From Swiss-Prot:
Keyword Transmembrane helix: yes
Domain of life: Eukaryota
Matching Pfam families: Sugar_tr (PF00083)
Name of the protein described by the UniProt record: Solute carrier family 2, facilitated glucose transporter member 1
Outcome of substituting R215W: In GLUT1DS1; impaired phosphorylation by PKC
InterPro entries in the record: Glu_transpt_1 (IPR002439), GLUT (IPR045263), MFS_dom (IPR020846), MFS_sugar_transport-like (IPR005828), MFS_trans_sf (IPR036259), Sugar/inositol_transpt (IPR003663), Sugar_transporter_CS (IPR005829)
Binding sites annotated in the UniProt record for cytochalasin B: T129, Q274, W380, N403
């Protein structure tokens, strides 16, 4: 358990980087848009059109989701061929390439570099959410396996928060240091590049994927700390039997047979309910929505949503196992549906009452606080509980595609919907939050 901390802590760095890159583009939105118009003038002697500047910057945040899709498609490619440890170590290449492309984007007067960098890091982030959850599971003892598996989620939320903190005007969220705000990912990457070579390879990769019965226990004896591991070594050979007993079905065989078309419908929808609820409307445009209200120091209100999100993440841990899963998901959608309304109330009466800007903060704070106990974790505590070791890997891949797709719809189209709906944007979220509430109250079972 001593050497165990190093093997995990070096893997979580990717999940911290996952959370970072997700929420870096929140506070420094205004300053990077000023760079886009400044580049547009220098090239063509012309101020950029606002509708074009919108779809252009929306593409700069949304393309990251497209990368995540490809990445989560390719997790199995590198995992089973190159290993778990060696995969996370080489994929730091993308992080550096992306840091260079985004850091030197301003110096080259190229928004293409920034977009291209935002994409490459998206690939890294789509792969990371397959490497890290898998590596920590194939490392920790069965007892500590449930607890240490949480550090991935915490890495996402804390990473978002650090990005929003560094997004202040005092620090890096300004006209001078926004290229460094995007590029600072090289530090965690360089740290993980130093740590991982000293971390142990996944025993399950040595035992199964490479048939090294004796080299495996050479790891667990230093990893588990215990001298012998005769029982754990056989625990792996017991689930290797249970994982490979039934044929692992493919994505194609999942849609075809009508034995899986009802569980998958639940899986996909619950993924759409995580994204089309509209939390990445906050975690991407928090500082923009708050400014559209009457918020003073709007970047701090985003850090508030970041802190609130971190808080209720920890609370959720002691509630998921302490209560049901149908209930915590219905409560979540209902809470978000109320805050989405409370937002519209706080956004409509603000023009008359110069203090509803405070209510908008209370609203979004509850909007993300309820998400973290409902449509955040539950969609993963059901898909895995709807498929055995055979068709489960195929369900993750579809849910991954379903998650990145829906996440791309929000991140890309939210600013196109905001110019038309005005204060009635969160109505769409409120509508969808109801459809997802109806669907779960009837067509979704309990586990
Ligand atoms: C079952 O294995 C897991 C467990 C947890 C996770 C965590 C995660 O990435 N969850 C959401 C996003 C999210 C969760 C909780 C709070 C805020 C947010 Br934003 C996600 O985007 N997953 C994507 C990256 C994914 C889905 C399926 C397969 C690969 C990647 C991923 C796979």
């Amino acid at each position: 358990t001593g050497r165990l901390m190093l093997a995990v802590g070096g893997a979580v760095l990717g999940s911290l980087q996952f959370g970072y890159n997700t929420g870096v583009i929140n506070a420094p939105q205004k300053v990077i848009e000023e760079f886009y118009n400044q580049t547009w003038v220098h090239r063509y002697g012309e101020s950029i059109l606002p509708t074009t500047l919108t779809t252009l910057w929306s593409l700069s945040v949304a393309i990251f989701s497209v990368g995540g899709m490809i990445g989560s498609f390719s997790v199995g490619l590198f995992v089973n061929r190159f290993g778990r440890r060696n995969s996370m170590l080489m994929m730091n290449l993308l992080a550096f390439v992306s840091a260079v492309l985004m850091g030197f984007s301003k110096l080259g007067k190229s928004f293409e570099m920034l977009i291209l960098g935002r994409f490459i890091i998206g690939v890294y982030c789509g792969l990371t959410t397959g490497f890290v959850p898998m590596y920590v599971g194939e490392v920790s003892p069965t007892a500590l396996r449930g607890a240490l598996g949480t550090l991935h989620q915490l890495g996402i939320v804390v990473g978002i928060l650090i990005a929003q903190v560094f997004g202040l005007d005092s620090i890096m969220g300004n006209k001078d240091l926004w290229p460094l705000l995007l590029s600072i990912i090289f530090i965690p990457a360089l740290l993980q590049c130093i740590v991982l070579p000293f971390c142990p390879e996944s025993p399950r990769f040595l035992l199964i994927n490479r048939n090294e019965e004796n080299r495996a226990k050479s790891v667990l004896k230093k990893l588990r700390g215990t001298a012998d591991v005769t029982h754990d070594l056989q625990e792996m050979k017991e689930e290797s039997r249970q994982m490979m007993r039934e044929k692992k079905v493919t994505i194609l065989e999942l849609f075809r047979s009508p034995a899986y078309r009802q569980p998958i419908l639940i899986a996909v929808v619950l993924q759409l309910s995580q994204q089309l609820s509209g939390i990445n409307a906050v975690f991407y445009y928090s500082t923009s929505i708050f400014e559209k209200a009457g918020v003073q120091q709007p970047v701090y209100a985003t850090i508030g949503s970041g802190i609130v999100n971190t808080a209720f993440t920890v609370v959720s841990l002691f509630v998921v196992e302490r209560a049901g899963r149908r209930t915590l998901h219905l409560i979540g959608l209902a809470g978000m549906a109320g805050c989405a309304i409370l937002m519209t109330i706080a956004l409509a009466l603000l023009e008359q009452l110069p203090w509803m800007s405070y209510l908008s903060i209370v609203a979004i704070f509850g909007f993300v606080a309820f998400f973290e106990v409902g449509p955040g974790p539950i969609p993963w505590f059901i898909v895995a509980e709807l498929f055995s070791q055979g068709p489960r890997p195929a369900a993750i891949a579809v849910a991954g595609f379903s998650n990145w797709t829906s996440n791309f719809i929000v991140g890309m189209c939210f600013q196109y919907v905001e110019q038309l709906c005005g204060p009635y944007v969160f109505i769409i979220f409120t509508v969808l939050l109801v459809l997802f509430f109806i669907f779960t109250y009837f067509k979704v079972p309990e586990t």
